[model samples]
Target: STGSATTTPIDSLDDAYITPVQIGTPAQTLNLDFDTGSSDLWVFSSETTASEVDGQTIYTPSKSTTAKLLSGATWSISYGDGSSSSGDVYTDTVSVGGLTVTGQAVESAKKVSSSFTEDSTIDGLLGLAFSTLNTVSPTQQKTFFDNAKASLDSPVFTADLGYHAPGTYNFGFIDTTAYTGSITYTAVSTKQGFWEWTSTGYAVGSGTFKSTSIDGIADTGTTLLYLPATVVSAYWAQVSGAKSSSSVGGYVFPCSATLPSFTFGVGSARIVIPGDYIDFGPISTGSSSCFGGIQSSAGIGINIFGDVALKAAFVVFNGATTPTLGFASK
Candidate 1:
């Protein structure tokens, strides 16, 4: 059944983020940020030598009786954020909700960046987003989903982001209750595995903004909400003292004052983003310029609704059942 909210078509590569299911008895729960951009399931390890790697909950293999290391497999990941890590591959008994799977391929990054080493909350990443983009393969290493598919209640997997809640990305089971009842599904093109759509238009401060409504894509791999330049400029104009300055990327603004509230229309579904998200922080160009939630792009043609907009809805990436992307309320 389609959720009441509109549905979008998702490509195989669109499944970039997977909700991590914890493994162990009397289970200690941990949420994983899965990336289709990279391959390998890596968690913080207690064996890390870096003192800067604090706050993150380290997974102690010693605690798990089923933990096993693949003698020859190795892995590494680099992020656009200038963070990188390298480690060896291993397998462990893993569980999501009440379901359990064994000999799951995992990574232990011997070398991690200070950014990752400093964060305690981010335990590790689960790379079940896509198989083709993964570093390890069925021929070399097995993924958590591929290994546990037979044990899963349904061959289908669904990820529900809970916004700012504790369990934002809940995995394993599709909560039909979260969806409104209809999903808008699209077909994946042969070019690239990205779910793309066209925006009918966008609304700013209760009115339609000036911009070209073209094909846009929803990417879980990206964290920022990207839109066409005209749309971004017109929307930011409503914010008091919001000015453009070169900073992190482009169009940095001053976040001193309360910004305006904005909403984006994706077909019939309107997503509202608060002002705080707009005024992220001051740009480092020594300007008091802050950043708006929407970033400007040149000739990119496609607008990307990243984490910011996604947080507003219950997104279901149904890779197994059908090539579909469904959205609903919390």
Candidate 2:
């Protein structure tokens, strides 16, 4: 099962944005992002040239009195979104929630764009996904999880995202009290570095959709759900009294009435999407309409079930023991 990553609105004070977790006896702060598409934790440093990074926040190690750097290694990574960053490797004491893991690997990108230069809310990203996508090589040493896993109380690590204000991201242990039932576990396949899964079926309201079972990957990196055209069209047909509408380059609908509930089958697990999540971002279109839950990605080939789907359940990624994925509830 996949769990939710904690998020807070981008705020002013830098400390408010940092997630404090312990490394050794010292505490360190890291920025959090809902990234399931890639795995690796990266931070920004004072050495970065002010051109490559944009809009997001950058972390300055110099600001932290306890920050430390590693020797003899360099790091860089390119994202599927066409964004890339490169820098040196550094080791420092790191902390998240109450757990501490010392000598943790941190990447500091020296070249950044306005995406990171403009925002002061978050300093860097602490990737909670798997380690397959890590930009650092084995010669440089251990990954954040590789170093901390042995010290953690449980062999498993979990992310708990909340629907209410102040969603939380924790490590080392899974807080079962946050969920409603026992966690569900699914084995992970080494397909494309993603925890790929098969959808048994999809439904909009009471009418079940007749289409190919969705074969997609669950990603925390993306913010919205990307579905195939057939599935998207079928989903819109079920919206109660929904009026056809359009956006800059996509579809929109007026779902003022009690919208239908949509669900995706993950083998034995049936995950449902509430009407509220369907609305997504506020209606950009003029009508009293909102964005539909399903979005068109006709040419993208890959359909991604992002945070909206992950937040509904507790997720566990067991990389050490045969690369399995487990899901539970909060």
Candidate 3:
């Protein structure tokens, strides 16, 4: 009824989180990004163009006895950054942790953008957002979580991300020991297919809490915390040598700057993001200037509470009749 799996950071900077997934008979294992920002469980597979493949581990449908091609089914998905992948679809036995789904729709990539090919950390993406966002043509397919939700003891999953470390993703039930304090639940706007919610407000370090509703999505796939320009500017203003650099594309500060922590309210809960996490890392290896983990969301269209913020708390993606997001200290 319940399943758990370790989610590891893909890079030293904890830019992305990856978890192991088994597809089809004989259990072909692939490390996939558990993206809560989008829908479409797609993978780099044998059908992917050879020219588009780099060092990624590809799924070979021929090796899986349970694989069945979905007639006329095709899909394509792209991110805000323009990186994309697309291909045919197949119905296969997919398993995450110990939770298995008999007829899970698996999108096999035939073409991938250069950015996806260059990132060798993930072999595919297991979308945890609403199934309505699936890009499969002819018929929309359910996500792995959506298909598995009905049979679960409790129709919910949790994300416990780590900073430069390993964490977990739990299905069916919440692991009480994984987090501290009581979880603060909030309404989720599932109409847009994202786990979008509104935060009560935020405060810079020990500053006053600005009372305003800031709407954003909890995107585990994204790397940084993006907020309104006003909030971003307030946080960075406290750091000794911080500046908004056009050349760097966002806010950057001296590597040695004493960065202020960020805190955001969920209902009545206050989740604090450590200053160390806000430093992100040096813009480049051995560089004295570091890119900020918190940046302006103006260009992004919507604010994103990415890995930088998620790692600071335990998050539950509740898939009950009325969806809700639960946040807790860890």
* Model 1 residue 327 lDDT score: 59
Query: In model 2, which runs have C-alpha deviations exceeding 4 angstroms?
Result: 1-28, 50-58, 62-68, 137-142, 209-212, 240-247, 255-258, 283-289
> What TM-score should be assigned to candidate 2?
0.79
Judged by lDDT against the true structure, how good is candidate 1? 0.58
Q: lDDT values of the candidates? A: 0.58, 0.61, 0.93
Q: Give one digit per residue, the lDDT tens place, for model 3 in 227-272.
A: 9999999999998889999998999999988888899999988999
User: C-alpha displacement of 73 in model 3, angstroms?
Assistant: 0.6
Best by TM-score: 3
Rate residue 54 of model 2 by lDDT. Answer: 53
lDDT of 1 by residue, 178-234 (tens): 666454443332134345555556777667653445565556556667787777888
- For residue 246, model 2's alpha carbon misses the true position, in angstroms, by 8.5
TM-score of each: 0.75, 0.79, 0.99
Question: Which of candidates 1 and 3 is the stronger one according to TM-score?
Answer: 3
**CA displacement after TM-score superposition, residue 329 of candidate 3 (Å):** 0.3
- Model 2 is weakest, by summed lDDT over 10 consecutive residues, at 12-21
lDDT per residue for candidate 2 within 1-330, as digits (tens), equals 222235663432111223433322233444555456766667765577766545444456666555676666777777655566778866767656545555677778786455556555555666555666667764444555656677766556664544434566655566767767666666566567676766677777777544456767777665566788877777777666554454344556664556666777755666677766666543643556656656766756788777666666666656565766667655
